[PDB]
Structures are given as C-alpha cells and as structure tokens.
Design a protein around this ligand. Sequence first.
Ligand code: POV
Ligand code: POV
Ligand code: POV
Ligand code: POV
Ligand code: POV
Ligand code: POV
Ligand code: POV
Ligand code: POV
Ligand code: POV
Ligand code: POV
Ligand code: POV
Ligand code: DU0
Ligand code: ZY8
Lengths: 1107, 183
Amino acid sequence: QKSWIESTLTKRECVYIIPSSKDPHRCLPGCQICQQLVRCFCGRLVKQHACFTASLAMKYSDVKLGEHFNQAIEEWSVEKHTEQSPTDAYGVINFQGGSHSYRAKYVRLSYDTKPEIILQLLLKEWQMELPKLVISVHGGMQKFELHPRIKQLLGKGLIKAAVTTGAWILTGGVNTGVAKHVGDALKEHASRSSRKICTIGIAPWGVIENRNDLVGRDVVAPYQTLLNPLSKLNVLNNLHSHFILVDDGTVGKYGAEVRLRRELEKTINQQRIHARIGQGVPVVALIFEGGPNVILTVLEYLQESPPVPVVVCEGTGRAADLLAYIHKQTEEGGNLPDAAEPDIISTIKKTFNFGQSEAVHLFQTMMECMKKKELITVFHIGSEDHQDIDVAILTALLKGTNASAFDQLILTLAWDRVDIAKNHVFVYGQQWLVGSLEQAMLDALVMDRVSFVKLLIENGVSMHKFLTIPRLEELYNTKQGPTNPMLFHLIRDVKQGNLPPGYKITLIDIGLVIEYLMGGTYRCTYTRKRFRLIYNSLETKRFPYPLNELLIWACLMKRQVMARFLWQHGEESMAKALVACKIYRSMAYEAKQSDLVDDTSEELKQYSNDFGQLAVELLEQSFRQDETMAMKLLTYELKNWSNSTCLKLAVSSRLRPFVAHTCTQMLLSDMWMGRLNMRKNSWYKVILSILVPPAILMLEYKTKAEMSHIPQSQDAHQMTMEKKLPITRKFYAFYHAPIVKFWFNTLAYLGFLMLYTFVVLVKMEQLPSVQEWIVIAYIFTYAIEKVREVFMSEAGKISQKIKVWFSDYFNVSDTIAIISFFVGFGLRFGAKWNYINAYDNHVFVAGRLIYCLNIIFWYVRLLDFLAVNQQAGPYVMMIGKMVANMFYIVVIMALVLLSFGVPRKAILYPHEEPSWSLAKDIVFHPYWMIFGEVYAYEIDVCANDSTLPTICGPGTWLTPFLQAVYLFVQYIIMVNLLIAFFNNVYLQVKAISNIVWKYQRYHFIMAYHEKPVLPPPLIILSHIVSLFCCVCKGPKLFLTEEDQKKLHDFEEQCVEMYFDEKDDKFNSGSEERIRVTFERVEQMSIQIKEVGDRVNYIKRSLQSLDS
Amino acid sequence: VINFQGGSHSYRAKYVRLSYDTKPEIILQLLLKEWQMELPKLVISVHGGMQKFELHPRIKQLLGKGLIKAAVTTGAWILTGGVNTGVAKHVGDALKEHASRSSRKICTIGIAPWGVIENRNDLVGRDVVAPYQTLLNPLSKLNVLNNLHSHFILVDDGTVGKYGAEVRLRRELEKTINQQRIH
Ligand SMILES: CCCCCCCC/C=C/CCCCCCCC(=O)O[C@@H](COC(=O)CCCCCCCCCCCCCCC)COP(=O)([O-])OCC[N+](C)(C)C
Ligand SMILES: CCCCCCCC/C=C/CCCCCCCC(=O)O[C@@H](COC(=O)CCCCCCCCCCCCCCC)COP(=O)([O-])OCC[N+](C)(C)C
Ligand SMILES: CCCCCCCC/C=C/CCCCCCCC(=O)O[C@@H](COC(=O)CCCCCCCCCCCCCCC)COP(=O)([O-])OCC[N+](C)(C)C
Ligand SMILES: CCCCCCCC/C=C/CCCCCCCC(=O)O[C@@H](COC(=O)CCCCCCCCCCCCCCC)COP(=O)([O-])OCC[N+](C)(C)C
Ligand SMILES: CCCCCCCC/C=C/CCCCCCCC(=O)O[C@@H](COC(=O)CCCCCCCCCCCCCCC)COP(=O)([O-])OCC[N+](C)(C)C
Ligand SMILES: CCCCCCCC/C=C\CCCCCCCC(=O)O[C@@H](COC(=O)CCCCCCCCCCCCCCC)COP(=O)([O-])OCC[N+](C)(C)C
Ligand SMILES: CCCCCCCC/C=C\CCCCCCCC(=O)O[C@@H](COC(=O)CCCCCCCCCCCCCCC)COP(=O)([O-])OCC[N+](C)(C)C
Ligand SMILES: CCCCCCCC/C=C\CCCCCCCC(=O)O[C@@H](COC(=O)CCCCCCCCCCCCCCC)COP(=O)([O-])OCC[N+](C)(C)C
Ligand SMILES: CCCCCCCC/C=C\CCCCCCCC(=O)O[C@@H](COC(=O)CCCCCCCCCCCCCCC)COP(=O)([O-])OCC[N+](C)(C)C
Ligand SMILES: CCCCCCCC/C=C\CCCCCCCC(=O)O[C@@H](COC(=O)CCCCCCCCCCCCCCC)COP(=O)([O-])OCC[N+](C)(C)C
Ligand SMILES: CCCCCCCC/C=C\CCCCCCCC(=O)O[C@@H](COC(=O)CCCCCCCCCCCCCCC)COP(=O)([O-])OCC[N+](C)(C)C
Ligand SMILES: C[C@@H]1CC[C@@]2(OC1)O[C@H]1C[C@H]3[C@@H]4CC=C5C[C@@H](OCCC(CO)CO)CC[C@]5(C)[C@H]4CC[C@]3(C)[C@H]1[C@@H]2C
Ligand SMILES: Oc1ccc2c3c1O[C@H]1c4oc5ccccc5c4C[C@@]4(O)[C@@H](C2)N(CC2CC2)CC[C@]314
C-alpha cells in the first residue's frame, strides 16, 4: 500500500462506550442529556466516537444496557475494549516560521508497540543517525522561570554536550515545563546544529492541542504556536525535530508514554555505539525543576541493571533543589547526619502539601537517592564548579557504573572529546592494563581520531612496540573509517586484474603500489627479499621506522590531517615531505585517467602542494642556518626511501620551487665548476686552457674540504682521497669538469658552423670538399651521441626513455636536423653527375637545397648554447612562451590579411584562369604591408606615376580605399594590440621563465656528468672505449660516519627551529593578539560583574555590623 | 644513548654506569671533554623527598617557570635524582611546559643508582643506542628514569635495592665544579 507505517504502526479507538460515573448534569428530560454531556469512560463524549460498528447501536439508546452489575463498570481496559486500526497520521508538522522554517516529524503510535519496532522506526524510516549519547531531560510541568544568569549556563551546557557528541535529547515534547527551557537553549545557540542535534519529544496524543488538524496520511500539516487565552492545554515546542505520540484513552489521561519512553532507553543502550566498540550507547538523565512523580523516576533509574546515572541541577528550585540539598549534607554511603528529619520533611512539604503522613513516604525515596551518590552529579552554580555541565554530563557517565579505564577511554574516543579524556581519564593514579592503550591506538588510527593519537603517544604509547605487521595489515583493511575509494583501483593495476571478492590486502601488494606511484627505479621495503621471507614466517615482526610506514598509509588512504600529524614525528622530515608530494601527485594523475563519478584529483593536487610547500620551507630554514650543510641535505642517500635523494625526489615530483630555490642553485653552480675554483678563475682562463693544455696547471683548484658538499663519481672520489694535487691529477680534474666539457663542445660547435656555413655559401663540386667531410663526420658522430643519451639515461623501460626525450624542444629539432641532413647528403652524394653543367641534375639541387635549409636548425641551436647564461636563458625560454600566447592575435591578423588580398586581386586582375598563382597573389603583397612596404606606386593604378598602368580598368578605384582600411586595422589596431599584449603579460611570463630556466639546470648539469670528455668530431674515440670496457667487464655524496652524525643533528635542529618560529610568528601577530585580548576581556567582564555582585553581597553586612 | 620512546619529540640522553670510588678529577674529566658539554655558570642541585607527590596547579606554574628562566638565562646544570620518583617528575614537567628547545642551554644531569632502576640489563652494551620505555608498570614498584634529562650518572655499591651510593659522589661532584673558574 506504499506505506511502511500502515503495515507496522497502530492507531486505536475506544469502540466500546462505557458512560461516566453516575450523574448527568441538569435538564430534567433525561432522554436527551445522556447523549449531550455524559462522557465515555474512554474520556471523550458519545457524539465523537462515530463507531462504524456501534453507530447502529447508539440509535437504540446507547451501547450496553443499563445498571451493569457495579463490579463490571470498571471493566474498560485499553487491552480489552479499545480496538486497533491502521495509520491515521504521519507527515511533517512544520511550525509557523519564526526565526527560520523549523520542520519536524510525527508518528502517532500506540502503547503496545514492541521495543524492536520503535527502534526500527527512528533509524531506518526517518533517516536518523544512530546516536552516541541520550540525554533524557526530566522535570516538572508548568512550574516556570529560571533566572537570566542560570539560563545561559544551563542553556550553553546542554548544547555543547549534544553537538560535540551527536546526541539525542529526549524531552516531554509538549511546551509545558522542561521542553520550553530545552528549546530556548536551542534558540540562543543554534548555529544550524540541528543536523547534529536531534531532540525527540515523546508527548501523548492527549493534552496536545490541534490533534485533529494532524489527521492525515503523508500530510505536511501546518501548526500554529499562538498562546490560546481561554485554553489551558499544551502545544508542541517549535524547536524539536521528531515527535512520538502515544494514546491510551484520549485527551486528558496524562500518562501513557512513561513506560514507552523508558523502554526506548533500553533499546538504545543495547545497541553498539560503533562497529569497533563493544560498549553500548550510554544514557544520562538531566534533572531540571522537578516534581512528585520525578522522584519515582530518578529512583527507578538507579535501581536497574545497567544503572543509568542521573545529573541533577540546582538554582531552579523544586525537587531538583531537594536532590541538591539532600545530597549535600551527606558524606559517603551511610544513613544520615545528626537527626534533622523535622527539617527535611518540613522542606519536602513546602514544595507540595503532603503533611507529615506521605511526606514521610517521600523520605524513603530521598534516603535511597542519597545512597548512590556516585551516580548523582550535582552542579553547583556560583563557584564555576566542574566547568560547563557538558563536562559534567559526560563525566557522570565515567564515575559510576564501575568499568575499566579502557572502557572510560574508548567511550571518549567515540565522542571525539580529548579534553574529557585528558583531564578525567588521564588523571594521576589511574592504572592501565598491558595491552589496553595499544588497543586504544589501533581504534584511534582507524577512526581518524588524530588528537587521541597525540594524547596516547604523550601518555606512554610507543609506536615502535605498537606497530606490528599484522596490525598494519589491518590499518589498510578497514571500511570502518574514512576510506580511499582509489586504493583498490591502484592494487588491481599492479596485480594484472585478478580480484577475489573478499581480498584482504597484503603489504606485498601495497609495495607494488608505492613502486608504481614513485616511478623509475624505486624499490619499496615491502617487495624485497628480506621482507618476503619474514612475511612467510608469520622483535623482527616489528618495524625499525614505524612513522615512515604510517605516513605512507595516511597518504594512500587520503587522510591528510593524519598525515600532517605523522609527518612532524620522526626523522627525515624534509625527505618524507617530498615523498608525500610525489605519492599524492601520482594519485592525482591516476584520478584523471580513471572512470569514477568522484574525481577527487583537485583534492590530491592540493595535498601534493601542501607537502611540497613544507619541503621548501624546511630548505629555506636549513639554508639560513648553514649554507654548506643545507647543500649536503639535498644529496645524501636516505637509506629508507630506496637510496634516493631529496633532489631526485623533488625533480621526480616536478616541484619547481625546490629546484629553483637558491640552495639547489648554489649546488648546481658548484657541480658545474667541478674541481675548478671558478671564484678566483675566469672564463678567459678556461677557454685558454682548452687550446693550451699546459695552461691547465696554472689554474687554482678546490681542496678536499672545499668539496665535502658536492657529489662525485666513485673514481673521482679516489682522486680526492689522496697546493696539493700532483700533475696527472690536475688533468683529470680539468677535462671532467662540466664547465670544461661545455666550452670544449661549444668551441667545436662554433667551428662546425663556420665550416658548414662555408660549405653552403661556396660552390659545390661533385665530390665533397675537406670542409664538407668534417661536417658529415660531426653530424654522424653527433648523432651517435644522441642515440647514447636515449638508451643510457634513467628509466628501465625502453619506450619510456623515448617519451621523455622527445618532450624537449631542441631534442626534437635535432632529430629533424640529423635525419634531414642525411636525406640531403644522400641526394647530394648518391647522384649521377652531369659533367657539363652543375644544377642540371635536379637530384643534386634538391640535396644542396636541403643543406641550405638544414643549416637553420644549427644556428637556432646556438640559442640552446646561449641559454646557459643567467640573463640570456630566461629570454630564450620566454620567446617560446610568447609565441604560444599570441597565437590567436596572429590568427586574427591573418584573417584581416585574407579579407584584403582576395578583393584586391579580384578587382585588379579580372581575367585570370585558375592557377596556384592565385593563392600566392592574395597573400603575398598584403603580408609585406605589415612590415613597412606600402607599395606606394601600385596604389591607384590609374594614376600617372603608377608602375602598373596596364592594370587600370573598370573599378580599380576601390583598392586605395580597401588598403587604407587594411593598414588602419593592421598597424593602428592589431600591431598596437600586440604591443599592449606583450607589455601586460611580460612580468608573469618573465617570472615563469625564470623558474623554468632554474628548474631545468638540473637536467642540464647532471647530463654533463655523464657526457664524455671529448667533443662530437672526436667523440668516436670515446664510444670505442665505452664499448670496450662494458663488454669485457650517477654521482654520490660521500660522508664519513662522524659527518652523517653531524648532518642528522643539523636536520633535526633545523626542523625544531622551523616549528618554533612558526608558532612564535603566529602568537606574535596582531591578528592573534587582538583575539586573545578579546577572549580575556570577555572573561574579565564576566568576573568583575560577578565580583561586583559579591561586593554588593558585602554591603548587606555593612548595614548589619554598623548597627 | 638512552633514547626515550618519543612523546612530544625525540629526547635523547646519555649514561655511563660508573663505580663509587671514582676519583673527583676523573668524574670532572668525564662531563666536559667526552660528552662535549659546556662548563656551566650555575649548578642548581634540587633536593626533596621521593614518591610523595602532587603539587597544586597554581604552584606548579610558578615553580616550573622559575626553574627554567634561572637555567636558560645563566646556562646552568640542574642536578636531580634522575629516577622518576619524587623531585625529577616535577623538574621534568617544568621542562615539558616551557621547553622552547632550550635543552641546548639546559643540561639536567640525573645522578641515580644502578639499583632501583628498571630495565638495567637492557642498558647493557658497549656503544649502544638502546631504546627505553616509559610505561608505568602496574605490578612493579621500582622507578624509571625521567624522559626530559640529558645525562645520567649511575653508581652501584651492591645491587638492585641498597638505596644509597650516590649521596657522596653527587656531593663530591659539587666540590669539583666550585673549584673550577667560571670564566
Ligand atoms: C632541411 C629542411 C627540411 C625540414 C624543414 C622544416 C622543419 C619544420 C619545423 C619544425 C619545428 C622543429 C621544432 C619542433 C618543436 C616541437 C615541440 C615539442 O617538442 O612538442 C612536444 C612533442 O612531443 C612528443 O611527444 C613528440 C614525439 C615525436 C617528435 C615530434 C616531431 C614533430 C615534427 C614537427 C613537424 C614538422 C616537421 C616537418 C619537416 C620534416 C613536446 O612534448 P609536450 O608537448 O611537452 O608533451 C609531451 C608529453 N606527452 C607525450 C604525454 C604528450
Ligand atoms: C636519437 C634520435 C636522433 C638520431 C638520429 C640518427 C639517425 C639518422 C638517420 C638517417 C637516415 C636518413 C635517410 C638516409 C638517406 C636515404 C634517402 C635518400 O634520399 O637517399 C638517396 C641516396 O641513396 C643512396 O643510396 C645514397 C646514400 C648514401 C649514404 C647516406 C645516407 C645514410 C646515412 C645515414 C647516417 C645516419 C646515422 C647516424 C648515427 C646513428 C636516394 O636517392 P639518390 O640515390 O640520391 O637518387 C637516385 C637517382 N639518381 C642516381 C639518378 C640521382
Ligand atoms: C605566434 C604563433 C602564430 C604564428 C604561426 C606559427 C604557430 C606556432 C605555434 C603556435 C602554438 C599554438 C597555440 C595554441 C593553439 C593550439 C592549436 C590550435 O590551433 O588550437 C586552436 C584551434 O585553432 C583555431 O581555432 C584557429 C586555427 C587557425 C590557425 C591558422 C594559423 C594562422 C596564423 C599563421 C601566421 C600568419 C601570419 C600573418 C599575420 C602576421 C584551439 O586551441 P586548442 O587546440 O583548444 O588549444 C589552445 C590551448 N589549450 C590547450 C589550453 C586548449
Ligand atoms: C593562407 C592561405 C594560403 C593559400 C593556401 C593554398 C596553398 C596551395 C599551395 C600549392 C603549392 C603547389 C602548387 C605549385 C606546384 C609546384 C610548381 C611551382 O609552382 O613551382 C614554383 C615554386 O613553387 C613551388 O615549387 C611550390 C611551393 C610549395 C609551397 C607552398 C606552401 C603551401 C602550404 C603552406 C606551407 C608553409 C610552411 C609552413 C606550414 C606549417 C617554381 O616556379 P616559379 O616560382 O613560378 O618560378 C618560375 C621560374 N622558374 C621556372 C625558374 C622556377
Ligand atoms: C605555420 C604557420 C601558418 C602560416 C599561415 C599560412 C602561410 C601562407 C601560405 C601560403 C601558401 C603558399 C602560397 C603559394 C602557392 C603556390 C605558388 C605557386 O604554385 O606558384 C608561385 C611560386 O611562388 C612561390 O612558391 C612563392 C609563394 C609566395 C611566398 C609566400 C610567403 C608567405 C607570406 C604569407 C605568410 C602569412 C600568411 C597569412 C595567412 C593568411 C608562382 O606561380 P607559378 O604558377 O608557379 O608561376 C608563375 C610564374 N611567374 C612567377 C614568373 C609569374
Ligand atoms: C667539426 C668541428 C671542428 C672543430 C673546429 C676546428 C677544426 C677545423 C679546422 C680546419 C679545417 C679546414 C679544412 C681543411 C682544408 C683546408 C683548406 C681551406 O680551408 O682552404 C680555404 C681556406 O679556408 C680556411 O682557412 C677556413 C675555411 C673554413 C671557414 C672557417 C674556418 C675556421 C673553422 C675552424 C676553427 C674556428 C673555431 C672557432 C671557435 C673557436 C680556401 O678555400 P678552398 O678550400 O681552396 O676553396 C673552397 C672550395 N671547395 C669547398 C669547393 C673545395
Ligand atoms: C662514401 C660515403 C661514406 C659514408 C658517408 C656517411 C657518413 C659516414 C660517417 C662519417 C663521415 C665520413 C668520415 C670522414 C672521412 C671522409 C672520407 C673521405 O672521403 O675523405 C676524403 C678526404 O677527407 C679528408 O681529407 C678529411 C675527412 C674527414 C675529416 C674529419 C674527421 C676527423 C675527426 C675524427 C673523426 C673521424 C671520422 C668520423 C667517422 C664517423 C678522402 O677521400 P678520397 O676519395 O680519397 O678523396 C676525396 C675526394 N677526391 C678524390 C676528389 C680527393
Ligand atoms: C624519416 C626521413 C624520411 C626521408 C625520406 C627520403 C626522401 C627521398 C625522396 C626522393 C628520392 C629522390 C631520388 C630520385 C627519385 C626519382 C626522380 C629522379 O630520379 O630524378 C628527379 C628528381 O626529382 C626530385 O624532386 C628529387 C628530390 C626529391 C626529394 C625532395 C626532398 C625530400 C626530403 C625533405 C627533407 C627531409 C625531411 C625529413 C625529416 C624527418 C629529376 O632528376 P633526374 O631524373 O636525376 O634528372 C634531371 C631531370 N630530368 C629527368 C628531366 C633530366
Ligand atoms: C680559438 C678561440 C677560442 C675563443 C673564441 C670563442 C669564445 C667562446 C665562444 C663564444 C662566445 C662566448 C664568450 C663569452 C663567454 C662568457 C662566460 C659566461 O659567463 O658564459 C655564460 C654563457 O655561456 C655561453 O656559452 C653562452 C653562449 C656562447 C657560446 C655559444 C655561442 C652563442 C652566442 C654567440 C653567437 C654569435 C653572436 C652574434 C654575433 C656574431 C655562462 O656563465 P654565466 O651564466 O654568465 O655565469 C658565469 C659563471 N659560469 C661561467 C661559471 C657559468
Ligand atoms: C609562411 C610564412 C610564415 C609567416 C610567419 C609565421 C610563422 C613563423 C612563426 C614562428 C617561428 C618561430 C618558431 C619558434 C616558436 C616556438 C614556440 C614554442 O612552443 O617554443 C617552445 C620552445 O621553443 C623555443 O624556445 C624557441 C627557441 C628557438 C627560436 C625559434 C626560431 C626562430 C629563429 C629562426 C628564424 C630565422 C628566420 C629565417 C629562417 C627561415 C616553448 O613552448 P611553450 O609554449 O613555452 O610550452 C611550455 C614549455 N614546454 C615546451 C616545455 C612544454
Ligand atoms: C558610399 C560612401 C560615400 C561616398 C560618396 C561618393 C561616392 C558614391 C558611391 C559609389 C560610387 C560608385 C560609382 C563610381 C564610379 C564612377 C567612375 C567609374 O566609371 O568607375 C569605374 C566603374 O565603376 C562602376 O561601374 C561602379 C561599380 C559599383 C560600385 C559598387 C559600390 C562601391 C562602394 C561600396 C558601397 C558604398 C558604401 C561603402 C561603405 C562606406 C570605371 O569603369 P568604367 O566606367 O568602365 O570606366 C572605363 C574603363 N576603361 C577605360 C578601362 C574601359
Ligand atoms: C577560408 C579561406 C578562404 C580562402 C582560401 O583559404 C581558406 O580558400 C582556399 C581555396 C583555394 C583555391 C582552391 C583550389 C584552386 C584550384 C587550383 O586549380 C589548379 C589550376 C592549375 C594550376 O596551374 C592547373 O594546371 C588553383 C588554385 C585554387 C583556385 C585555390 C586558390 C587559393 C584558395 C582560394 C585558398 C584561399 C587562401
Ligand atoms: O634550464 C636550462 C638551462 C640551460 C640549457 C637548458 C635548460 O633547459 C633546456 C632548455 O629548455 C628550453 C626551452 C625553451 C628554450 C630553450 C631551452 C633549453 C636550452 C637547453 O636545451 C640547453 C641549455 N642545453 C643544451 C645546450 C648545450 C647547452 C640542454 C638543456 C636546456
């Protein structure tokens, strides 16, 4: 029937009508007054039942003929004579808008609803979250009027208890008594926190007004909140979210829900608070201004398994304050103080007039409520006692119901409340079991509870003894937390597609993910021989560096707040940040290349740039402390990250601000020098020493101690271990310096162009000249070296070597230049000569003309040599970026060109056959007009000074007007638009070009450590040796053990200085000092007004003691 | 190194395990040259009662702050009992509140015995960076070292138990510093 409520829930009607006690009121003609006023013992009168069965019985006189044997008059029970029926009510009970819209729900169910059915209602149907706290408020109806001061504290404490725990608040529902003060607390401090606060009012379907207006199946009914003057009944409170309405008889009969509300508390406390915690949901009882039936409710909570605790307030003044006074004058669980019962029972009867007879009956309840003091928490207002009742609500669930501190701690873990756990669980004197704090850590890591991981580490948990292999197997294999939906896609990409449905993840599989993300020759510690054998066997079952293992975990599970926390703890801070920058970057690249409805690539790319910024800020901190030791931090092997290097990790991430940072640029500048001391040399001297080999020995070099921060080769280190440096060592130092390899290739390249310019300008005979064979020998041997750069570069995959190398500009240009040369040399050399006149062989012409065009590639390649300079380099990279940026302005200039050329050719040349010359003529002249050529005497072809007098004809007077418009658009609009484009894009392209230039000095300078000594006409001598030693049989930074110790102390010290100066800059800013002033002046305003009230309590005794 | 299991930070420290009959010139030669320590300008030998406990919160801030600003502004050594019972628990919690990585200037030297200390056999080793736990052992009653010290001097007369051998040697250390020139 498209209604889950109708198949399960229940209305119920009083179908069998028993009249009232004896008496109809007045009005002698008795036959009419038995219908007009006589109520049913149901409670409603006889004309409102309508009783489809007994409607045929009311016509006789009524149901059930007369006197009915007085024992049988009482016989109406709601079980026997009150018949059940389907729904009649559910929908939205939207209150008339005050501050906001304020929707809510209702059900109208029976009394005999089973406890499993009512639990099934709240969770599944109404889409509510299973809570972590139930605050059942209880007090007295209709009494009223807290003070203004106490209204703020009890109001604020009830909210911050519920929004920080995600609690249900069970109220009476109706606006009398408690719920008026519960909702006014919601009026003050809402902050739209009804998403987290779910106040559930359990009222009856009785004393509520406008019950017949709520009649309806799936009806969004409006409901008014106007205080009805003539009436005395109660309305619902506007700031509730859900209503449960129970009817036993009818309007009046003010109790049916006391059992059902209490049975609801039993069902929640039997449900698990979380899918990892065996403890059940706690229930607390808050007591405002109370009553006579309240005392039976408080005692019914304490006498139960489990013993639900009770929180009692004071200051309101009723039975609430009786429980405050009775609990106060009482020590631990003995009978009484001195005999002051005439003072107690007198105080009981001033609340409600009992009169010494059953006021004694209240005292047996007051002596059982002073008995269980441990489960009673009184909140004394006026001495800031126990600090904001939300502490005292949550503390009351820890003092009584004796359980382990583990049970106290894991309860706070579900609430996500550390200030209760720090100040009331980790107190002095608390004794802990051996494995309890470890089980708390395992729960807190899965549940993404960062501030508890911080608390458990400070209170004794060691991650070294904690983080085992099977436990870290679990941390990946949880769905009981915020998981990454991307990790399972990464695992199937490295296991070739096999996916069983259960599939507990192994660490052999995670390592294959890390090696896939880090790329290159990265080898994780999971996929090596030592780990696989001890993984088969299952101390050695622990990890040496646990916080390296969890930092990867937090990144792969996309738990950034956990990752930032686990980064600060442990060693190798700048390295872990660069690894994390790479791991998120690779997952961001996999996210785009994957068919998911949730991209989450911009989230990972932001996370990659956060750790990248941390790496730069640690390098800046290390560079300010000591320049030389910071350059060592860039190049020492890490021994926990696949023997990699902080440069190699940042270059792998393409993290430009690290490579462009002034520390790496000093290191790159010093690797360029080699063992030459180019601070006290000159570039004149390096070039001179290439041409004059004996001039090498007059050059100042660097000592072994001036090179401890520079990585070297293995055999280059052997040269340094031994004015030092005898003769044959100084030749190795010179010719293997990258600066020398450069000029020794540059001078050979300039001599190459001088020859290849000579070849192409001078007449070519049949056989090549001596100059031309030197050219061929260069480009051939130059091509071999380019083949060697491809094969022997970085990445094991041969096709991946290809994709990197064709990504640079001049490497693609070299490929076209090398191929087209031998196409040209082939046509040139391998052609049948004529012997009568050259250039009657069109194959030889085509070969020569390729030389004339191929030489452009080799002059533009001088920009490639010019880009080594600090000033010229950024401009060369700038030219390319400006061409790409101005493309669409130039396209517009090309359409304006064709808009003019086509009509000019059409008007001036009306008698043309189809020819490809027409394509030339519509483009040619209008293009040269952009560049200054007006063609002054071809304008106005019918003039006397015209150089085209035969073109004069019909309508050629239009073309001067066309060309006037053309050049206005080209120079005056489009050329000046293009000047303006470059001006206003200059600074941000010059800036980008500086960083790109500085980034790519790494790949440039680290290439010259691997290039041979000898330039590309003579390099073939070096390729023979390279094949000789390979068939027959990069740089590292060496450190002794006392220099690794001094370096690790430097890395640790500079990280400590980083977080201290970061905290000192935040605490000393103007923004933070104003607000801490703001928060203290707020508290001082509270105290002085409250001390100002105490000193007014002093002057009452001044008038007394003056008397 | 007797590196404590990381709480707030790494918190390294040293130890020696020496005798009772060490000559006063030898113990002075130990602290300065070998452990690369600076000769101080103040020695604050704290003394109190073991295992008693629990200062108030208000008095914990003033006595905590005053002991640090005495030591960081003078470059002082603080001589404690070393073990976590009694005084050194309150000396180190002063270091927890107002550290500001000022262990570069603060050199708290704990002189404990090699007796009542737990995990003494785990510290057995020539040039060994040994790990050391700070877990409150429930069944036990013995004392652990305090994590926020920097140097430990450990004197054994008999064995575990026998709670006094260092009272003479700690006092003879104070004689050697007061015979050295402050500058
Ligand atoms: C004697 C006279 C005869 C010849 C004179 C005429 C000479 C003509 C003038 C030519 C201009 C010369 C300079 C070229 C600059 C190219 C820029 C570049 O590198 O772009 C990209 C090439 O990315 C690649 O993957 C390229 C792969 C193959 C090589 C490209 C050949 C282009 C041919 C040119 C066509 C003309 C050739 C016609 C002539 C034969 C760089 O990569 P990316 O953009 O960073 O993205 C890479 C990553 N990705 C792989 C994931 C996408
Ligand atoms: C990492 C990437 C960068 C590296 C790239 C490196 C690879 C570069 C690849 C280069 C290869 C390019 C093609 C070669 C020429 C063939 C095309 C052609 O037009 O041939 C002509 C010459 O035909 C001949 O038989 C004579 C050729 C003599 C040898 C020179 C070409 C090969 C050299 C290559 C050395 C390169 C090796 C470099 C070292 C590895 C055919 O026409 P014809 O015969 O003239 O005319 C016939 C009619 N008639 C007789 C009536 C006139
Ligand atoms: C200074 C350069 C111009 C000079 C020529 C040499 C060019 C040198 C290289 C330039 C780099 C290219 C820049 C980006 C464009 C990529 C390719 C492309 O065409 O894309 C566009 C399609 O194209 C069109 O919509 C128009 C096609 C007409 C081109 C005709 C050339 C006329 C100019 C010739 C000169 C006549 C001179 C007469 C006047 C003096 C669309 O863009 P896209 O594909 O979506 O990509 C854009 C950016 N994105 C990747 C972020 C989306
Ligand atoms: C924007 C709109 C433009 C129009 C679009 C339509 C284009 C249609 C193109 C058509 C060209 C083919 C038709 C002609 C056939 C060859 C014969 C010939 O004319 O030879 C002539 C030269 O010219 C040539 O040899 C041809 C020129 C080829 C380049 C054309 C560029 C086209 C595309 C752009 C590529 C640019 C590169 C960049 C690309 C990225 C030789 O003869 P002559 O010079 O008359 O001299 C006579 C005297 N003689 C006997 C002594 C020699
Ligand atoms: C890469 C970025 C994209 C660039 C954009 C596209 C580039 C433009 C592409 C244009 C296409 C090429 C046009 C020529 C067509 C073929 C010519 C031919 O067949 O014969 C002609 C050969 O003449 C030539 O070969 C020279 C061609 C003129 C030079 C063009 C310079 C570019 C100017 C524009 C640059 C900006 C263009 C703005 C765009 C609107 C001669 O005719 P014939 O019949 O062989 O002989 C006649 C005999 N007679 C000579 C003795 C009288
Ligand atoms: C690949 C890299 C090599 C490295 C470079 C050094 C090695 C190269 C060195 C020398 C090789 C020269 C070839 C040997 C034959 C000598 C004859 C000769 O040249 O006679 C000519 C004189 O011309 C000259 O003296 C120079 C001619 C080339 C111009 C550039 C010279 C400087 C290049 C290198 C130094 C600059 C370095 C700049 C940077 C510091 C006279 O002309 P012809 O020859 O009678 O007539 C030509 C007609 N034919 C062609 C049709 C036959
Ligand atoms: C057939 C096609 C061969 C394949 C082409 C494809 C590329 C092949 C690879 C490379 C190109 C060839 C290598 C150079 C040798 C040239 C040979 C030659 O003919 O020399 C001639 C002169 O030559 C000279 O006097 C100098 C020649 C080379 C000088 C440069 C190399 C020195 C540097 C170190 C590097 C060493 C070289 C590097 C090697 C990689 C002698 O020949 P000839 O006939 O007696 O006389 C010439 C004309 N005559 C008869 C009118 C007088
Ligand atoms: C991957 C690289 C691929 C390279 C492919 C290799 C291409 C090889 C292509 C062609 C081979 C040419 C050999 C001859 C073929 C038959 C014609 C013939 O014999 O002679 C005719 C030649 O006519 C011409 O036009 C010759 C030039 C053609 C090549 C054009 C440049 C291509 C390279 C672009 C630049 C490189 C860019 C590449 C950069 C990537 C006419 O001459 P003849 O007959 O001797 O007699 C005179 C006239 N008679 C007959 C009237 C008397
Ligand atoms: C046999 C006779 C032998 C000598 C003759 C040949 C002389 C030598 C060859 C050429 C001229 C260079 C001489 C000046 C060098 C200055 C040093 C310098 O600072 O270099 C910078 C650029 O280094 C370069 O190499 C820039 C490019 C020049 C070589 C290639 C020719 C392109 C430019 C010209 C083409 C034609 C131009 C148009 C006009 C025709 C690099 O240094 P930096 O960043 O400034 O920082 C200084 C510290 N550092 C050096 C440690 C890095
Ligand atoms: C038909 C008539 C034509 C009409 C006119 C129109 C046609 C003429 C138009 C354009 C011609 C200009 C060509 C250069 C354009 C490069 C653009 C580029 O992408 O550069 C790239 C590098 O490239 C450089 O840094 C270029 C360096 C070499 C200079 C170019 C040669 C010009 C000089 C010789 C000329 C001498 C003249 C005589 C010879 C004939 C940079 O690319 P990017 O955008 O920064 O991308 C981001 C970085 N990334 C690459 C790593 C991914
Ligand atoms: C409109 C703006 C204000 C201007 C006001 C003043 C001007 C009034 C407006 C327009 C004037 C049009 C007529 C003038 C020609 C008189 C001379 C003549 O004969 O010329 C030629 C013909 O010329 C023609 O046959 C005219 C062609 C039609 C032009 C279409 C509109 C042009 C302007 C665009 C639209 C306008 C809007 C444009 C947007 C601003 C010569 O040919 P012929 O006769 O054979 O000569 C003998 C040749 N023979 C000896 C070689 C054999
Ligand atoms: C959007 C833009 C509109 C303008 C435009 O670009 C695109 O549209 C293009 C189409 C081109 C024509 C296509 C076909 C031919 C036929 C050919 O027939 C051989 C004849 C003879 C050779 O001698 C046989 O022997 C001669 C050339 C011609 C007319 C082209 C001329 C240029 C034109 C007009 C181009 C022009 C730049
Ligand atoms: O930062 C770099 C600093 C210096 C150099 C490079 C850098 O990056 C490269 C790059 O990229 C460019 C993009 C656009 C325009 C020019 C370039 C260049 C130029 C270059 O090709 C070049 C010099 N050498 C070879 C040449 C022998 C010197 C190789 C490396 C190279």
